[PDB]
Every structure is written in C-alpha cells, then in structure tokens.
C-alpha cells in the first residue's frame, strides 16, 4: 500500500515492556502520540505513553479499545490469540498482519516456513508421542536437542541428548508437550541480523551482531560480529530472502548459527525489535526502534550504517547495584534503563552500549568495570 500514518497520529502498542518503551521514545521524537495496553499499571512503556490501558492481552474488549483510539497498531507481546489477531487485521490498522506471527509462534511451523523460503536450518523432526521421539533419535542420532514447539524461552522446555542416558529426560518432556527434535549444530558463533521492511516494501538490513548468552540470557552483542566476510555476507543475504519470502512488514530479528567452515543455519525468528539489536540505538545511523516506527507508518526507512563498533551489555537485576556504584567509570558507555519498578535477579533492567573504534577495547571495558563478574566466570 501507499497508506501513510503521519506524525501527530497515535501509535498503539500491545505490550508495555522495554521494547514498547523504546518504540514509544523513538516515535515521540517524530511527533507521534502513543497508546499502550499492558496487564500491569506503570509499565516501562506506560511511563512514556500518552494513554495507558490496563488489561489482559486476551481481553478482546480492551484490544478493541486500544485499536479504536489508535491510527496504527503494533505489538511487542507476540502471544496474541487468533480471535484478537483476526479482529485487529480486519477492523483496525495492523500493517504487520497475522501471518508472520502465526509462523514464528511454533518452532515446527517456523522451521517449515524457513525451508519453504529456501533457507537452511538444522535437520529436525516433529515429536508428538513417544514413538515419534524414538524414530527421531534413530534418524538424527546423537547429539540432538528436543524443544517444545510452543511456550519455550530462556532454554526452558529443552533437553539436549548426548547419549541414551539422556533419553529418560527427553521422554519426560515429550510426555508433557508437543516437541521438535533438532540435530545438534556444532557452530563457532551465534549471530543475528535485524531486517526491516516497510508497508510499501522498502527494505533495510542492519549489520551482523555476535551474541553471547550466559545462563540462557543474552549477556553481550558484539558489532561487527567477529566472523569472516563469507559468513557476514551470507547472514545478510539470508535475512533479506527471509524478509522477502515472508512478506515482512515491520521488524524481523533473525538468529543464526555460524560454523567454522562458513555455514549459516537459521535458528529462530522474532517478528519485533529484539535484544540483540539494542546496539543500534547508539552505534547505527537509525535504531531498530526508529526503523520499526517508520516501517509500520510507511515512512522512508533510515540508513543502517554502523557508525562505530559497539558492545552491548545487558543489565539484569543482579547488576543494577554495580552499575549505579560504578557510574563515574562509565566513560564511552551509553546507559539505557527501562524504568522497571522492581529488580529481580534475572530481569532485564537495562543495557549499556560501549562504543569504541576497537571491539577488544570495548570488551575489555566491560571486564574492567567488574559488574558482570558472574557472567565472566560462567564463560570461563
């Protein structure tokens, strides 16, 4: 379409977490008003929003209320059910649509969609009962990984199978939920690419980021990713094909495995701004949040050039004390805090973007701060 949502209009956001907040901040710079729906009062996004609706995500009356006061609707919360999605796409303006969301919510459906797009993933099998598990183990051998098709996050609902000794735990998981078995990919680095596509079909792709997870939570994103030119260009090419084949509108985070000998496998997709793209706030010509707003409002997209190398480091509840105490050591460090009321140990409270001409110096800065010693030790 050529449908444009002009500055001055209201953008409605389903989900009031940090992703919503950062969307709202970028939209405010451009003169947009913001409405947000979230089940808890005073969410990070509500602190920036003009209008706040406190309600469950599955409350259709409240979704309708959000839509009826918004000129365009988007989401950070992905688990919107079909009845709400169909209503939104037909009776509100939801340029992102429902089709991509439905593919990314189920690991089996997601992998099917990626292969149909022509892109490589780990060899996988659907597991709906004990016999399918047995057949899958015999076909894919060891090592392999069993994951729940839905609801899985932070490595939960996941069993790695290294030998027959692991089968018992795998059977327990498969007893409890629909699963997929994937062949274990021996990779060197986990990487991600944020890709943007506007309503009118303009596309932009951000640089490849190298992602380091510790205890199933992202710790650092490094840009440029420390991978060969071959791996880099391949990752970017794959992300574009995905955007094109999936008919993306908005933002798509493509998480990948990169092997020593130059292969990329697509691991999973997120149809929203993503933690591995927070680096863009300080290091790129446009942030993933500014791009997201432009894409859904059908404005011309900004450029995605990396202006300075960067290390994004996540700030969890366990880190917030150390961050405030070390505040006067934060030279070259660009702090972002989400305004969450309560710190919980593993809850994401913010992040810091460490900019430097040299990635290793940025990495050394994170270390020398001694805030993430816990994460550092687990990596050692």
Ligand X SMILES: Nc1ncnc2c1ncn2[C@@H]1O[C@H](COP(=O)(O)OP(=O)(O)OP(=O)(O)O)[C@@H](O)[C@H]1O
Question: Which residues of this protein are in contact with ligand X, per CB under 6 A?
Answer: 15, 17, 19, 76-79, 122, 145, 147, 152-155, 158, 182, 184-185, 190, 213, 216, 218, 255, 267-268, 270, 272, 274-275, 340, 344, 347-348
CB 231 within 8 A of CB 207: no
Q: How far is the CB of 164 from its own copies (least distance, A)?
A: 48
- Total Cβ atoms within 10 A of residue 186: 11
Q: Residue of minimal CB distance from Ca ion?
A: 154
Q: How far is the CB of 298 from Ca ion (least distance, A)?
A: 28
Taking CB under 8 A as the criterion, the residue among 1, 3, 6, 379 binding its own copies is 6
Residue 258, helix vs strand vs coil: strand
Q: How far is the CB of 364 from its own copies (least distance, A)?
A: 17
The C-alpha R_g of the chain, in whole angstroms, comes to 21
Residue number, 170 or 266, with CB nearest to Ca ion: 266
Angle ∠(126,128,130) on CA atoms, nearest 5: 110
Is the N-terminal amide bond of 47 cis, ω within 30° of 0? no
List the beta bridge partners of residue 243.
none
DSSP type of residue 317: G
342/324 Cα distance (integer angstroms): 15
Name which of its own copies, ligand X, Ca ion, none residue 347 binds, using a CB cut-off of 5 to 8 Å depending on partner kind: ligand X
CB 15 within 8 A of CB 75: yes
Q: By CB under 8 A, tell whether 40 contacts its own copies.
A: no
Provide the phi-psi class of 141: left if phi over 0, else alpha when psi is between -120 and 50, else beta. left
Name which of its own copies, ligand X, Ca ion, none residue 145 binds, using a CB cut-off of 5 to 8 Å depending on partner kind: ligand X
Residue number, 71 or 190, with CB nearest to ligand X: 190
247 is in an annotated binding site: no
Taking CB under 8 A as the criterion, the residue among 237, 241, 337, 361 binding its own copies is 337
Residue number, 113 or 315, with CB nearest to its own copies: 315
Burial of 44 (0-12, 13-18, 19+ CB in 10 A): buried
Residue number, 216 or 233, with CB nearest to ligand X: 216
Residue 378, helix vs strand vs coil: helix
Residues that bind its own copies (CB under 8 A): 4, 6-8, 25, 28-31, 33, 47-48, 50, 281-282, 285-286, 299-303, 305, 307-308, 324, 327-339, 350, 355
């Amino acid at each position: 379409m050529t449908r444009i949502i002009l500055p001055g209009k209201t953008i409605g956001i389903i989900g009031g977490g940090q992703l919503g907040r950062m969307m709202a901040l970028a939209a405010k710079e451009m003169g947009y008003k913001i409405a947000v729906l979230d089940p808890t009062k005073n969410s990070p996004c509500a602190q920036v929003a003009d209008i706040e609706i406190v309600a469950s995500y599955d409350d259709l009356k409240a979704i309708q209320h959000l839509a009826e006061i918004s000129d365009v609707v988007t989401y950070e919360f992905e688990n919107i059910d079909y009845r709400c999605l169909q209503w939104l796409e037909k009776h509100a303006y939801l340029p992102q649509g429902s089709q991509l969301l439905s593919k990314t919510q189920n690991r089996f459906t997601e992998k099917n969609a990626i292969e149909k797009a022509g892109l490589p993933v780990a060899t996988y099998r659907l597991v709906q009962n004990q016999e399918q598990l047995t057949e899958a183990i015999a076909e894919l051998s060891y090592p392999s990984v069993l994951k729940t098709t839905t609801g899985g996050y932070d490595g939960k609902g996941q069993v790695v199978l290294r030998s027959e000794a692991d089968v018992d735990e795998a059977r327990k998981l498969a007893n409890a939920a629909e699963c997929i078995l994937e062949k274990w990919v021996p990779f060197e680095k986990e990487v991600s690419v944020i890709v943007i596509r506007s309503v009118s079909g303009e596309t932009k792709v951000f640089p490849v980021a190298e992602n380091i997870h510790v205890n199933n939570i992202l710790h650092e994103s490094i840009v440029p990713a420390r991978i060969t030119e071959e791996l880099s260009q391949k990752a970017i090419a794959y992300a574009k094909v995905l955007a094109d084949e999936l008919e993306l509108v908005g933002t798509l985070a493509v998480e990948m495995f990169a092997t020593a000998d130059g292969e990329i496998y697509i691991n999973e997709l997120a149809p929203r701004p993503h933690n591995s793209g927070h680096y863009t706030q300080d290091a790129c010509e446009t942030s993933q949040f500014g791009q997201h707003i432009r894409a859904i409002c059908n404005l011309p997209l900004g450029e995605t050039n990396l202006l300075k190398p960067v290390v994004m480091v996540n700030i969890l509840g366990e880190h917030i004390e150390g961050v405030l105490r070390q505040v006067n050591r934060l030279t070259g460090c660009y702090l972002h805090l989400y305004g969450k009321e309560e710190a919980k140990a593993q809850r994401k409270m913010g992040h810091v973007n460490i900019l430097n001409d040299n990635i290793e110096v940025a990495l050394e800065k994170a270390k020398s701060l001694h805030i993430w010693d816990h994460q550092e030790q687990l990596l050692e």
